């Protein structure tokens, strides 16, 4: 079996940085790749700060160990601005760059030529057909989806997306890697939305349409789902938390792919908020105003 | 204002008994109504067993206290087989009987003649237009929906449904009553599913379709929604928990009113289980099998 040990994470953003951190924390050798030295420096800095925040807690009764732990985990993460030079002998490449199909495909088409034979390619894409990226290579049997959830270092779920061409060997390798990260992997075919978003987003859009219809206030709907369905956050609180722009992008995609399905119909309210740059918590305002 | 003190609860089933229990526990005088003295005896007995179970846990440091609590609550719950015999002096009627329009309308059409003038009529129905029931009476301004959730004694939410004719006075009165019960009322128009079921049920159906479509197993979908979305129960565990027959019933209704809507298309797997009398935890088998206690 191909036991993933050396991992190459391309993209030091919210997800990429978290992926790199959990891999390193769990004993894997990591090379985090991004476009500039500045982006990388900031990315690794946030990883350190996150690790320290946790250490200061579990190592109160021994500050020494705490710092050794952080230094150790942080020392097993390398950085680079040239992915091509790092994939020569990497066991796994996990991509988490800008959500743009053209950019992603060029990336892998290029990497496919440098990566070792056994190297597995995986995308953390939320709204893109894994197959639409696996065909940019001649490594389809070792290409798959590995979808994580933010905050990566906390969220225990990982969706292992297998395409019709993905081998069983590649699948089990990713399932074992997921468990090695201390995650609980589930399986799903290469369908839009996979499992979570496919069943969550459309529900959130329905929550918005109920409001636009004037049937109930945003506040009551949120209260209804929390007390009534036991959800951690009401649909609008969650919409703001995950980003209104992010949500809109996913739904618009499914809409352009099947403009007939009533579940993907655009929301006037959602568009207006995205228009006037109100993306939710990350912008200080979405359906609700924050801090 | 007219504060609800006397409540007539019609239906001693799962929902009704719970409603009576919470109302009586919070200081309201209650009359539980059902078809036979036996059914009523069984319901009130179930209310006692529930109160004593809550007592042993709350008054563990003083069983005597817990016995007084139970006895006091149980004492303010009278039982009658004909509601018309007590509504002339009740403040609110909360109906929770079989889910059938004709039966409900016949019930309220007749109670309308006994209930005092100030009496408010409320239906706990899940799949019927409140308005449809209200027009069986000439008291539409004092008619509304008061939708609870099982187990009533635990679930804090209560949906107060206002029809175009419900008066502001009736609405406020029901909201206050909701708070007096220790619940949290939310407002919604008389639309199919109200809030919770309108957003919950269609989602449960998509879960089933995702599975029947063979994109993922039931087990992984449940795991995915529990860990990825933070839900207490995965879609298939919740389906089995609320009732596959209860669910199929609600969806068929919506499907019937708007047959072209894809969101209400029937589930082959759901129908098959329902047809085989596999209703979920109620029968020991739904999408999953359970220990027939
Ligand atoms: N945004 C979310 O809420 C979310 C949640 C789950 C999964 N995702 C998935 O994660 C990936 C990135 O999302 P994010 O939130 O981490 O993004 P982000 O914008 O925070 O970070 C992406 C990083 O990629 C870098 N980047 C862009 N193009 C690159 C290229 N050609 N090569 C190398 N680095 C490049 C950027 O400079 C940036 O630092 C996407 O594939 C997306 O579908 C996003
Ligand atoms: N099942 C749920 O989870 C749920 C949740 C919310 C609301 N509801 C609603 O609650 C109501 C009852 O549901 P339930 O689960 O409590 O039912 P149930 O089957 O447990 O009990 C219904 C009770 O109504 C009585 N009944 C029938 N016809 C009657 C009549 N003409 N007069 C007086 N009593 C009569 C029966 O004898 C029975 O004891 C329905 O309107 C339903 O849509 C159900």
From Swiss-Prot, chain A:
GO cellular component: cytoplasm; mitochondrial matrix; mitochondrion; nucleoplasm
EC number annotated for this UniProt entry: 1.1.1.35
InterPro entries: 3-OHacyl-CoA_DH, 3-OHacyl-CoA_DH_CS, 3-OHacyl-CoA_DH_NAD-bd, 3HC_DH_C, 6-PGluconate_DH-like_C_sf, 6PGD_dom2, Mito_3-hydroxyacyl-CoA_DH, NAD(P)-bd_dom_sf
Positions with a binding annotation for CoA: 50, 57, 126
Post-translational modification note: Succinylation at Lys-58, adjacent to a coenzyme A binding site. Desuccinylated by SIRT5.
Any one GO biological process: spermatogenesis
One of the Pfam families matching this protein, by short name: 3HCDH
Protein name: Hydroxyacyl-coenzyme A dehydrogenase, mitochondrial
Species, as recorded: Homo sapiens
């Amino acid at each position: 079996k191909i036991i993933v040990k050396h991992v190459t994470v391309i993209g030091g953003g919210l997800m990429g940085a978290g992926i790199a951190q959990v891999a390193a924390a769990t004993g894997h050798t990591v090379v985090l790749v991004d476009q500039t030295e500045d982006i990388l420096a900031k990315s690794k800095k946030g990883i350190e700060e996150s690790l320290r925040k946790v250490a200061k807690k579990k190592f109160a009764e021994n500050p020494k160990a705490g710092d050794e732990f952080v230094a150790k985990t942080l020392s097993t993460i390398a950085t680079s601005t040239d992915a091509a030079s790092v994939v020569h002998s990497t066991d796994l490449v996990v991509e988490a760059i800008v959500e743009n199909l053209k950019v992603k495909n060029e990336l892998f088409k290029r990497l496919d030529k440098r990566a070792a034979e056994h190297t597995i390619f995986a995308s953390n894409t939320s709204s893109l057909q894994i197959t639409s990226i696996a065909n940019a290579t001649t490594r389809q049997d070792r290409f798959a989806g590995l979808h994580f959830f933010n905050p990566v270092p906390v969220m225990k779920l990982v969706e292992v997306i297998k395409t019709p061409m993905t081998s069983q060997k590649t699948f089990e390798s990713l399932v074992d890697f997921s468990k090695a990260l201390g995650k609980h992997p589930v399986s799903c075919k290469d369908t839009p939305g996979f499992i979570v978003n496919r069943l969550l987003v459309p529900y959130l859009m329905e929550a918005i349409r109920l409001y636009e219809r004037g049937d109930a206030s945003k506040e009551d709907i949120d209260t209804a789902m929390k007390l009534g369905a036991g959800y951690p956050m009401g649909p609008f609180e969650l919409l703001d938390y995950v980003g209104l722009d992010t949500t809109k992008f996913i739904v618009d995609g499914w809409h352009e792919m099947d403009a007939e399905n009533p579940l993907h119909q655009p929301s006037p309210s959602l568009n207006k908020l995205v228009a006037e740059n109100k993306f939710g918590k990350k912008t200080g305002e979405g359906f609700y105003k924050y801090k």
